[PDB]
Amino acid sequence: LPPLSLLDPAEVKQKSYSPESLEAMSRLLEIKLKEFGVEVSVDSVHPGPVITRFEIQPAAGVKVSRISNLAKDLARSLAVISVRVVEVIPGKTTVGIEIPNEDRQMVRFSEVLSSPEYDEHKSTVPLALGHDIGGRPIITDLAKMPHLLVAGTTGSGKSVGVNAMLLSILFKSTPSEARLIMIDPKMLELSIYEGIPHLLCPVVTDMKEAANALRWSVAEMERRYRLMAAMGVRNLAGFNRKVKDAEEAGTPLTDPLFQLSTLPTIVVVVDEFADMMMIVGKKVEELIARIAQKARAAGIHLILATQRPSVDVITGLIKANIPTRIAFQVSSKIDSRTILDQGGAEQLLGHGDMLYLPPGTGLPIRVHGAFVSDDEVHRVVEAWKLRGAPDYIEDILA
Amino acid sequence: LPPLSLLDPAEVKQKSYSPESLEAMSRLLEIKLKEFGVEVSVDSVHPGPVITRFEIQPAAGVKVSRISNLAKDLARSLAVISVRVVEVIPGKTTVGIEIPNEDRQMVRFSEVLSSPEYDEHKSTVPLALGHDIGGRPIITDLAKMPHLLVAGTTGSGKSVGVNAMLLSILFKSTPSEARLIMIDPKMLELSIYEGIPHLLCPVVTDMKEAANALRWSVAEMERRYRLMAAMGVRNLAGFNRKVKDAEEAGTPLTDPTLPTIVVVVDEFADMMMIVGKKVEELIARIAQKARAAGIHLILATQRPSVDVITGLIKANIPTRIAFQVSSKIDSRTILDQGGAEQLLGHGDMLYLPPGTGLPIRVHGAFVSDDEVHRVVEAWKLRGAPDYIEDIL
Amino acid sequence: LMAAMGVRNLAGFNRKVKDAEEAGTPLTDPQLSTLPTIVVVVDEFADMMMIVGKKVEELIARIAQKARAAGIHLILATQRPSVDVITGLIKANIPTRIAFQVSSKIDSRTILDQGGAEQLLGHGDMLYLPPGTGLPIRVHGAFVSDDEVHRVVEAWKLRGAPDYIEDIL
DNA sequence: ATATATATATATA
DNA sequence: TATATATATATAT
Ligand SMILES: Nc1ncnc2c1ncn2[C@@H]1O[C@H](COP(=O)(O)OP(=O)(O)O)[C@@H](O)[C@H]1O
Ligand SMILES: Nc1ncnc2c1ncn2[C@@H]1O[C@H](COP(=O)(O)OP(=O)(O)O)[C@@H](O)[C@H]1O
């Protein structure tokens, strides 16, 4: 296994944010909202890496839409790019306002991996997203999502996020524990990964080959459900603990359908499925529907990224069974209601700010995506090419 | 290599855009905004060749939308033709107001090429386009686009702009470093480029030779990726450095410099639907795969349509040029937000960068047929190129 | 023939005609005479494009995309400003449009791509939309009676026999 | 009290 | 079916 020292290590941050600067910014926000119609008093300050949440208590008898309908003007009168108004804070009467700082600290990916969450995270598919608005990291199990949608316009830090997720997979799991399928219609980003032992296929370029790979994944899901029926288990981890119990007693439990092995966790990533549904058509959308409908228990998981949030790409069928959404900076509030099904995705800053939406109804966790460099990615790729051979299958492309 | 003096020389340096005249304009703007409900205060003044930016400082309480929803009346009462309100200036607390200036000045192309951004440039295929709001030039780079759709109607800026791009190819590079392929089912516009040493074929008249040229380009893409998989090379300039090190050593190479290829089409609208939609898969495979090979596309059409500019061509080309399609309604076919709303026909354009954001305000620098024909004859003094019959 | 002669428009080829026997120096046939400017008037292309189909629209689009520097022009007249007649094919290629009194703003957006055509006072009072600037220029129509038409037809029939290319049909 | 902004309702590409 | 336009309604003036 690769160590945690291949990365560029933890840097020294420019933490010069004094309490007198916080008091000055608090009084400045009080004045600049008093100059408009509202009147508000700053309650407390949460300083952070990239943004700085202010908990402001409104006056007696002033609404919150009269704060949300001038977020642009409050951002203009403070010499910042854009402010974000959190309309509800769980457990308090205060309204949140998050102002970007000046010395925007780059989130160090080695600081994200150095957490007590990620270090003893037992699951074979973790995701180190990055630090949230208050400094601590957010590590999310990819098994429990079970799938993922990523969006945001170009240059808003999206391939960096997908590379952070794939390196989050690579620093924990062997090719006997996890396994990947990659699709790339734009060979700049994902072609750096061709050679790692966690692959089943060459990095898929054409869309007919990608349709063949997704039909192979349907067939693999169906035969895994039939094999779990033939062994009488319920989920994938139950089958892996069943064959582990066969390993513990030294007892060979043979093939129920003709010796079994620990089936690794397939993860199917897609760089741009908008091009896929635009080239091939509605049957690819129904194929992703038939994947997302059932493959939670079989251990086949989806990472979907797109650059075109619309009704044509992010449809009802894709939003049917993929409830976990990553949204970077997008253009309109209509696109925010397209992916996150609510406003608020447009207020971000670029450079990998995402609104993590967990599975289930909740306020979106604003997580700053950790920057990963081409040198670190290339070093992980070369370490796995020096510690692993490819495991290809011819049938996945035909 | 022709000098920059074969262009027409720099025109009359128009003075009398004085600080007292712009101060009178700024006080006029303060008075005309004070007559309505708002109160404004001009902070600084950014002049320019075509238009002028006024960084105004709004007072306490006045919103931006109050300024934006009377812009028609403000542009009426300033004796100007239009106005635009830049709602955000990064890092400053000031709203930008864009006012068209008095003399709609033409951008001189020698004023574009004389800047050190073009002269000390490092790549081989730049596209000098024009200036900003303040007159500082914007010299882009075609190697990072990596493909460039041009579309528009009504004879707006298109053929002059494509000539400016191809001259930006001409003035820097040699044919050994950057070749060209030209395709035009119109026999008219780009026929003046016949005989220049940067080409590879005649200016294509029979569209079956255009399909065979694109077929040769696809096979060239295939053999260049076979070359790079035989050499372990990501993008073309790495192999150019490797063959430079093999040329310093005289080292021959195996059979699995390479010329940079830029293919233009001016009327693929009727061509792609009459010759066959099999052309579109060729164009999409080139624009997908050959973005690291060196085969770049300056695609141009006279009819920007949903039929001929589909999503299949929108996929691999995120760097777009649109002058006048009809309006901001059918704009989303090529420029995804909005098009000919304040593009003044012959001139200003919207350059969509390889990233995104507010796209670049680019004034289309003028080129004339004397300059075009003179650069063509100056390169025809350097020689006639190689012509491949398999392309034809 | 203009690609053979290296000519950049029609007016350049009439300048080649001025280089020909107009200035007293005859040419060859690669003696090329004048190529006359053709103004093809169509009184009702709605009937044509609803009866015979869309291949006529393919022909009209291949003309209207290209024929400025050619020597063939079209005055298209109709009575249905609708998508059933005027599609987007014959929209972006004819940027100069005459709009008389129509009965809806929808038809005004169908032809002029804006509003204000149904407001006209009738009887030839049109909205000349010039090329380039997409702003309407309102023009009152000039009345010419049928007797003046018979006079001009008589004045041309008393001067020249019909010079036909009869094989057009 | 009433011009403005806006959410929705019907007609069309 | 997505959208451009049109009409009735809070809203703060
Ligand atoms: N966490 C981060 N810190 C700093 N910069 C970032 C971060 N994430 C992304 N970026 C910047 O954003 C850019 C990534 O854009 P990207 O989303 O890959 O474009 P596209 O959507 O076209 O693939 C990079 O150039 C990088 O500089
Ligand atoms: N910088 C400029 N200044 C003034 N006019 C320009 C400039 N650039 C282009 N033009 C005008 O553009 C016209 C040519 O349009 P063109 O590019 O041929 O459109 P199309 O190719 O659609 O016919 C010329 O009349 C020329 O005057």
Q: Which two tokens stand for residue B274?
A: 């009459």
Q: From the CA of A338 to the C1' of D8: give the distance in Å.
A: 19
Residues 6+ apart with CB under 8 A from C26: C20
DSSP string, B332-346: GGTSSS--TTS--SS
Residue ranges in chain A assigned as alpha helix (H) = 19-34, 65-68, 71-76, 109-113, 116-119, 159-170, 207-231, 236-248, 273-279, 282-292, 318-321, 333-339, 374-385
Q: What is the resolution of this structure in A?
A: 4.0
Q: How would you label A342-380 residue by residue, b for 16+ Cβ within 10 Å and e otherwise?
A: eebbbbbbbbbbbbbbbeeeeebebbbbbbbeeebbeeb
Q: Which two tokens stand for residue C121?
A: 């006072």
Q: Which two tokens stand for residue A323?
A: 């409830």
The answer to whether A183 and A284 are in contact (CB under 8 A) is no
Binding residue numbers of A: 155-160, 351, 369-370
**What's the first-to-final CA gap in chain B, in angstroms?**
28
Beta-carbon neighbour count of residue B58 at 10 Å? 21
Quote the radius of gyration of chain A (alpha carbons, Å).
23
Cα(A164)–Cα(A99) distance, rounded to whole angstroms? 26
Find the length of chain A. Answer: 398
DSSP string, B10-50: P--------HHHHHHHHHHHHHHHHHSS----EEEEE--SS
Residue A307's nearest CA partner among B354, B148, B142, B234 is B354
| Mutation site for B-interface testing, chosen from A73, A183, A189, A385 by largest number of B Cβ within 10 Å | A73
Ligand 2 atom, smallest distance to B161 CA: 17
Cα(B132)–Cα(B10) distance, rounded to whole angstroms? 19
Residue A269's nearest CA partner among A343, A328, A193 is A193
Q: Which two tokens stand for residue B390?
A: 């398999």
Q: Which two tokens stand for residue A260?
A: 């079994």
CA distances from residue A28 to A35, A54, A77, A361, C147 in whole angstroms, order as listed: 11, 12, 10, 35, 83
Which among A78, A185, A331 has the least Cβ separation from residue B288?
A185
- CA distance to partner chain C, nearest, from residue B187 (Å): 6
Amino acid identity, residue B125?
A: V
Residue A210's nearest CA partner among A313, A281, A119, A312 is A281
Element spanning A42, H or E: strand A40-47
Q: Which ligand is nearest to the CA of C8?
A: 2
Element spanning C75, H or E: strand C72-76
Beta-carbon neighbour count of residue A288 at 10 Å? 25
Residues lining ligand 1, judged by CB closer than 6 Å?
Answer: A 106-107, 154-160, 307, 351-352, 369-371
Record: contact A78-B61, CB cut-off 8 A:
no
The answer to whether A273 and A304 are in contact (CB under 8 A) is yes
Please identify which residue in the block is written with the tokens 């004796």.
B79
- Strand E within 7 A of B65 CB: no
Cα(A374)–Cα(A143) distance, rounded to whole angstroms? 27
Cα(A125)–Cα(A138) distance, rounded to whole angstroms? 14
Q: From the CA of B265 to the C1' of D5: give the distance in Å.
A: 48
DSSP string, C88-111: STTTTT---B-----S-HHHHHHH
DSSP string, A224-266: HHHHHHHHT-SSHHHHHHHHHHHHHTT-----S--------EE
Q: How far is C-alpha B326 from the chain's CA centre?
A: 19
Q: How far is C-alpha A21 from the chain's CA centre?
A: 33
Record: contact B205-C3, CB cut-off 8 A:
yes
Q: If you ran DSSP here, which 8-state letter would residue A176 be given?
A: T
CA B160 to ligand 2 centroid distance, Å: 5
Q: Which ligand is nearest to the CA of A351?
A: 1
Q: If you ran DSSP here, which 8-state letter would residue C129 be given?
A: B
Q: What are phi and psi of B6, to 5 degrees?
A: -75, -15
Ligand 2 atom, smallest distance to B266 CA: 21
Residues 6+ apart with CB under 8 A from B303: B153, B267, B269, B270, C61, C65, C92, C93
Q: Which two tokens stand for residue C11?
A: 């007016």
Which residue has the CA at smallest separation from atom 26 of ligand 2? Answer: B346
Closest-lying nucleotide for C110 based on CA to C1': D13
Q: Which ligand is nearest to the CA of A109?
A: 1
Q: Which two tokens stand for residue A198?
A: 């966690």
CA A157 to ligand 1 centroid distance, Å: 3
Element spanning C15, H or E: helix C10-17
Record: contact A72-B60, CB cut-off 8 A:
no
Please identify which residue in the block is written with the tokens 């549904």.
A277
Cα(A68)–Cα(A96) distance, rounded to whole angstroms? 11
Record: contact C92-B303, CB cut-off 8 A:
yes
Elucidation method: cryo-EM
C17: exposed, middle or buried (C-beta count within 10 Å: 0-12, 13-18, 19+)?
middle
3-state secondary structure at position B255 = coil
CA distances from residue A224 to B52, B342, B352, C153 in whole angstroms, order as listed: 67, 59, 47, 88
DSSP string, A327-361: E---S-HHHHHHHTSSS-GGG--STTEEEEE-SSS
Strand E bases, protein C-beta under 7 A: 2-6, 13
Residue C95's nearest CA partner among C72, C76, C70, C112 is C112
Number of B/C CB contacts below 8 angstroms equals: 45
Residues 6+ apart with CB under 8 A from A276: A183, A185, A207, A210, A211, A270, A284
Cα(C52)–Cα(C81) distance, rounded to whole angstroms? 18
Element spanning A96, H or E: strand A95-100
Q: Which two tokens stand for residue C154?
A: 């008589």
Q: From the CA of A168 to the C1' of E11: give the distance in Å.
A: 52
- Strand E within 7 A of A311 CB: yes
Binding residue numbers of C: 123, 141-142
Q: Give A-chain residues touching B91 at CB under 8 angstroms.
A: 79
Q: From the CA of B57 to the C1' of D6: give the distance in Å.
A: 29
3-state secondary structure at position A54 = strand
Closest-lying nucleotide for C109 based on CA to C1': E4
Record: contact C92-B325, CB cut-off 8 A:
yes
Cα(A157)–Cα(A353) distance, rounded to whole angstroms? 8
Which residue has the CA at smallest separation from atom 20 of ligand 1? Answer: A154
3-state secondary structure at position C22 = helix
Q: How far is C-alpha A300 from the chain's CA centre?
A: 16
Residue ranges and CATH numbers for the domains of chain B are 1-105 (3.30.980.40), 106-392 (3.40.50.300)
Q: Which two tokens stand for residue A25?
A: 């910014």
Residues 6+ apart with CB under 8 A from A371: A106, A107, A108, A109, A160, A351, A352
What's the helix, strand, coil split of chain A in %, to 5? 35, 20, 45
Which residue has the CA at smallest separation from atom 4 of ligand 2? Answer: B346
Residues lining ligand 2, judged by CB closer than 6 Å?
Answer: B 106-107, 155-160, 302, 346-347, 364-366
Beta-carbon neighbour count of residue A180 at 10 Å? 24
Most ligand 2 atoms within 8 A of CB, residue of B105, B110, B160, B299 to mutate: B160
Ranges assigned E (strand) in chain B: 42-46, 51-56, 84-86, 95-100, 126-131, 137-141, 147-151, 178-183, 260-265, 295-301, 320-322, 348-351, 360-363
Cα(C15)–Cα(C22) distance, rounded to whole angstroms? 10
Chains that touch C (3 or more CB pairs under 8 A): B
Please identify which residue in the block is written with the tokens 């009738």.
C122
Residue B287's nearest CA partner among B316, B257, B246 is B316
Element spanning A84, H or E: strand A84-86
Record: contact B267-C3, CB cut-off 8 A:
no
Q: Which two tokens stand for residue A183?
A: 């699709």
Helices (H) and strands (E) in chain C, counts: 6, 4
Which residue has the CA at smallest separation from atom 23 of ligand 1? Answer: A159
Find the length of chain B. Answer: 392
- Strand E within 7 A of C105 CB: yes
Structural gaps in chain C: residues followed by a C–N separation over 2.5 Å: 30
Please identify which residue in the block is written with the tokens 């709203």.
B95
Closest-lying nucleotide for C87 based on CA to C1': D13
Question: Which chain B residue lies closest to C9 (C-alpha atoms)?
Answer: B188
CA distances from residue B236 to A93, A316, A330, B122 in whole angstroms, order as listed: 59, 42, 33, 15
Please identify which residue in the block is written with the tokens 């050593």.
B249
Bridge partners for A178 per DSSP: A265
Ligand 2 atom, smallest distance to B153 CA: 22
3-state secondary structure at position B172 = helix
Q: From the CA of A90 to the C1' of D6: give the distance in Å.
A: 30
3-state secondary structure at position A127 = strand
Q: From the CA of B37 to the C1' of D1: give the distance in Å.
A: 20
Element spanning B379, H or E: helix B369-380
Residue ranges in B84-200 assigned as alpha helix (H) = 109-113, 116-119, 158-172
Closest-lying nucleotide for C115 based on CA to C1': E5
The answer to whether A227 and A197 are in contact (CB under 8 A) is no
Record: contact B356-A153, CB cut-off 8 A:
yes
Cα(A302)–Cα(A317) distance, rounded to whole angstroms? 14
Cα(C123)–Cα(B286) distance, rounded to whole angstroms? 56
Q: Which two tokens stand for residue C40?
A: 């093809």
Which among A76, A154, A185 has the least Cβ separation from residue B356?
A154
The answer to whether A349 and A100 are in contact (CB under 8 A) is yes
Q: Which two tokens stand for residue C89?
A: 């094919």
Q: Which two tokens stand for residue B181?
A: 């392929």
Q: Give B-chain residues touching C8 at CB under 8 angstroms.
A: 188
Residues in chain A whose Cβ is within 8 Å of chain B: 35-37, 70, 72-73, 76-79, 81, 153-156, 185-188, 205, 275, 278-279, 331
Strand D bases, protein C-beta under 7 A: 5-6, 11-13
Q: Which two tokens stand for residue B88?
A: 């955000």
Cα(A1)–Cα(A55) distance, rounded to whole angstroms? 44
CA distances from residue B387 to A290, B28, B184, B196, B391 in whole angstroms, order as listed: 53, 63, 17, 11, 8
Angle between helices B158-172 and B369-380 (to 10 degrees): 30
Beta-carbon neighbour count of residue C27 at 10 Å? 14
> In which order are the strands placed within the sheet that holds B42-46?
B42-46, B51-56, B95-100, B84-86
Q: What are phi and psi of A397, to 5 degrees?
A: -95, -25
3-state secondary structure at position A124 = coil
Q: From the CA of A303 to the C1' of D12: give the distance in Å.
A: 39
